[PDB]
């Protein structure tokens, strides 16, 4: 099962052919790893 799941993801890996295209896309999106927590153990992600 792990091999099958991996065989699907490999298609999305960056390659020398699609390297330039992926770079531009990354410069347009943003990933946010910031999230706080309360006393009740509840995540609080920022509204941005």
């Amino acid at each position: 099962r792990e091999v099958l799941q991996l065989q699907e993801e490999v298609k999305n890996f960056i390659t020398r052919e699609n390297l330039e295209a992926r770079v531009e896309a990354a410069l347009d999106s943003r990933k946010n790893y910031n999230w706080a927590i309360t006393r009740e153990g509840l995540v609080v992600r920022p509204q941005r």
């Binding site: 993801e9 999305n12 890996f13 960056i14 020398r16 390297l19 330039e20 992926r22 770079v23 531009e24 990354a26 410069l27 999106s29 943003r30 990933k31 946010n32 790893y33």
Partner: protein
Amino acid sequence: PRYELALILKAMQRPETAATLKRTIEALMDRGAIVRDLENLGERALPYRISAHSQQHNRGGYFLVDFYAPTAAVESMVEHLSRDIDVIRGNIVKHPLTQELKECEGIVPVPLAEKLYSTKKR
């Protein structure tokens, strides 16, 4: 194995920032790497003033690069980053998603230690 390259580039325009990213990713592939993703964390202000290549930086672009590579390719890639002027700071760490977290049951209370001293009348 699977690594993660926390890259802090210099505050530059889009044309120059794209040339540095591509230049940096071509160096990984030349050393036997298999890039997987390129996440952008956005351009922010550095927590402190960083000095690199005779330049005092106050801002930089944060980028992540998840990839697969052999063990011998890490040390050769750490040298390349040092030479590149556009890169303020770059470090490689084992990807945190390749470390399974053992399930936790809860906090176990610890009772006070007993029988530390003889039960004699001092």
